[PDB]
Design a protein around this ligand. Structure first.
Ligand code: 19H
Length: 149
């Protein structure tokens, strides 16, 4: 995906590590288009883990994530849930927020090494399945606008 992929991997990766563990990545992060996306994501996102906790918990249970090898096998189930039907920014937040929910879990069991791979995985599925649509919304820029004020 090049630019779209590089940008999405940064937003999602930082958001997931931010979610499990505190704290920002101080490194400046080819655009402030990314900073604006992280913040929109940070605010619209924290609700979702709240509201869907039971369901999220159930899904994680089925998944059985213990190690890095398990994270590498999640793509098919991840595409399965994501690509059915209608696309919107809200569905994307849900893909990303679960990813953050899964990421928190990864930390608890001291597998924080797995988070980067989880992010790569999520970004692959997002850009592969929804690429054309995303380009149409202008990508991350379209995202911040859709949720603005
Ligand atoms: C990181 C990650 C994200 C995923 O998101 C799939 C699409 C979002 C979604 C949707 C959805 O967009 O229809 N419904 C969900 C329900 C639960 Cl319990 C969890 C996620 C969703 C799905 C999986 C399996 C994984 Cl591992």
């Amino acid at each position: 995906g090049d630019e779209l992929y590089r940008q999405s991997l940064e937003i999602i990766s930082r958001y997931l590590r931010e979610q499990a563990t505190g704290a920002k990545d101080t490194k400046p992060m080819s655009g402030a288009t990314s900073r604006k996306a992280l913040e929109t994501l940070r605010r619209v996102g924290d609700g979702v883990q709240r509201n869907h906790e039971t369901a999220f918990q159930g899904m994680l249970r089925k998944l059985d994530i213990k190690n890095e090898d398990d994270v590498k096998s999640l793509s098919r189930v991840m595409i399965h849930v994501f690509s059915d039907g209608v696309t919107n920014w809200g569905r994307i937040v849900t893909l990303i927020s679960f990813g953050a929910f899964v990421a928190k879990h990864l930390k608890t069991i001291n597998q924080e090494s797995c988070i980067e791979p989880l992010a790569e995985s999520i970004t692959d599925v997002l850009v592969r399945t929804k690429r054309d649509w995303l380009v149409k919304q202008r990508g991350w820029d379209g995202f911040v606008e859709f949720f603005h004020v």
